[PDB]
Amino acid sequence: IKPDYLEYDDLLDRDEMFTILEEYFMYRGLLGLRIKYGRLFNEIKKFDNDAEEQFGTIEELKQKLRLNSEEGADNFIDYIKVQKQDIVKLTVYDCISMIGLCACVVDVWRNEKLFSRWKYCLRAIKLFINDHMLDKIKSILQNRLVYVEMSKH
Amino acid sequence: IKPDYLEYDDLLDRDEMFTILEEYFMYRGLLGLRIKYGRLFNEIKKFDNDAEEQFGTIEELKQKLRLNSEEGADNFIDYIKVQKQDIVKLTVYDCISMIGLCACVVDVWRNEKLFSRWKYCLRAIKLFINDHMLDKIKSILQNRLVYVEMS
Known part of the structure; x- marks a missing residue:
């Protein structure tokens, strides 16, 4: 049984990105x-x-x-698909921005009470971010959290 | 990709209970x-x-x-276990009541803002309701969706 990440302060190797x-x-x-x-x-x-x-x-947006x-969710997907096409060589920072974008988008849906649409963010992530990029994101978050630790102490 | 069930009006064979x-x-x-x-x-x-x-x-409760x-979630799990060991012969209606119970319990946690505890309901279901009982529940819900239309 894996942990719940809502109040999770870490990011270990065993944690799936x-x-x-x-x-x-x-x-x-x-x-x-x-x-x-x-x-x-x-x-x-x-x-x-x-x-x-x-x-x-x-x-x-x-x-x-x-x-x-x-057609909002379908549009978001096509937009994401368009982004992935148009970007010349994808960097981990593109993927990071893209996640932030999904997050901002999910806020719009929540406020509209289109609650089931959060699923589309996952569909978008899957299209945009391959396992190789997920690893690089996980590595970055692990570093960022280590510094947050230093900052704290 | 399976459907989202929040606003789902049906229950087909392809839908996993x-x-x-x-x-x-x-x-x-x-x-x-x-x-x-x-x-x-x-x-x-x-x-x-x-x-x-x-x-x-x-x-x-x-x-x-x-x-x-x-210790609230651990207590709920203990409770579920006890209730299960105690029931002589488990019926689908026991399993149905148990689900309703989890639902009522999750309401308590939500209001307290212990939002990650909904996971424990699933842990409880897994302990209490085997695949055989899930099938029987699915069959009942399928009938009830019909019974409701009738009315």
Whole structure:
């Protein structure tokens, strides 16, 4: 039995990166951010700054992708597919931004009470981020948490 | 890719009973009941009446098990185990009541904001309800979706 990552402060080798993301999008997509999260989720939450810098503001995407419309989730998927196409050589930082983007998008859906749409973030991650990139993200989060430890003490 | 069951109105052979329960406890345990549910979840929601009749009120269970305490989830699991060892011959209706019981319990945890504890309901289901009983429950829910239409 694996741990619950909502209030998890670590990221060990035994922890699966995708599962962390599954729970992250479930919890953020259903409960939102006004909740106690652990150091782990708190790090992933910072991916939001990246996403805005790379893909634009959520207010813009919301209008352009018509996120809250019936075709909103399908549009988001096509948009993600378009992003993956258009980027010349994908870096781990693209993948990080992309996650932050999903997070911001899931916020829009939660507020609209389209609660089942958090699933689409996972579908998008699967399309955008391969196992090799998930490893690199996990390695980065592990480093970032080690520094958060130093900062604390 | 399987469907999302939050607003699902059916229950087909291809739908796995455990997965339905996974999502049910996730959604009820995190969002609660003031949400649009499909006919499927609405049926499982009725398991609540069963649970009260068989295991007692949630107010009492909450006090007896001290559900919101640090040991609350472990206590609930113990409770489930005890109840199972105790039942001479387990019926599908015992399993149904037990699910309703988990549902009522998850409500307590949600209100306390112990949001990760919904997982324990699944752990409890796995202990209490074998695949054979899950099939019988699925069969009943399939009938009930029909019975409801009739009415």
